[model samples]
Target: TYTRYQTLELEKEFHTNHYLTRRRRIEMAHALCLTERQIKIWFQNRRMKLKKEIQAIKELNEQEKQA
Candidate 1:
């Protein structure tokens, strides 16, 4: 598991860009004491999670419209 500081920094970059460039990934990995693979997986998971949340919101909106 990542420390709070690590997670926060990762989240900050994620919010800035859903995908990280090769340069940014290496830079963040060094600063955060994580591997590039870990950062890559984290971003992938975050994107998928965000997609699911957006889908859920859309489904709720459709229900409200039908009601």
Candidate 2:
């Protein structure tokens, strides 16, 4: 692992952007001192994780409404 602050900054950008363009990925990659591909993979994984969490919440809400 690297610095916590750097990781936090990357995650903040990830959530704020929801999707990062290739240009922005390169920029962030440079700032974070990592490859652009790594950033892209992180984005894909985060997006999937967010999708699952949202689904879980919606499911729970529906169940509660029926109860």
Candidate 3:
């Protein structure tokens, strides 16, 4: 498997640029014959992944400020 951070980056791309979220992606997917589930999963995974990343960033920033 890939590293956690690496996977998270991919997730970001999917959520913000995937067929389910963006029109361009939708057209591309149509050309490639993609499924709705694939698009849906990308958005779901991306949001959850980003939520963790945001939490981690916030925590670290808090710690830094305290120190």
Q: What are the Cα lDDT values of the candidates?
A: 0.93, 0.85, 0.61
Number of the top TM-score candidate: 1
Give stretches of model 1 more than 4 Å off.
Answer: none
Task: Sort by lDDT, best first.
Answer: 1, 2, 3
Which pairs in model 1 have colliding backbones?
none
Report per-prediction Cα RMSD to one decimal: 0.8, 1.3, 5.7
Q: What TM value does model 3 have?
A: 0.55
Compared with the true structure, model 2 gives a TM-score of 0.88
- Candidate 3 residue lDDT tens string, 9-58: 55665656643546755663454454545545656776787789999999
Any residue pairs clashing in model 3, and if so which? none
Off by over 4 Å in 2: none
Residue-level lDDT tens digits of model 2 in 6-67: 67877899778989888999898899887888788878888999999999999999999983
Best by lDDT: 1
Residue 17: error of model 1 in Å? 0.5
lDDT of predicted model 3:
0.61
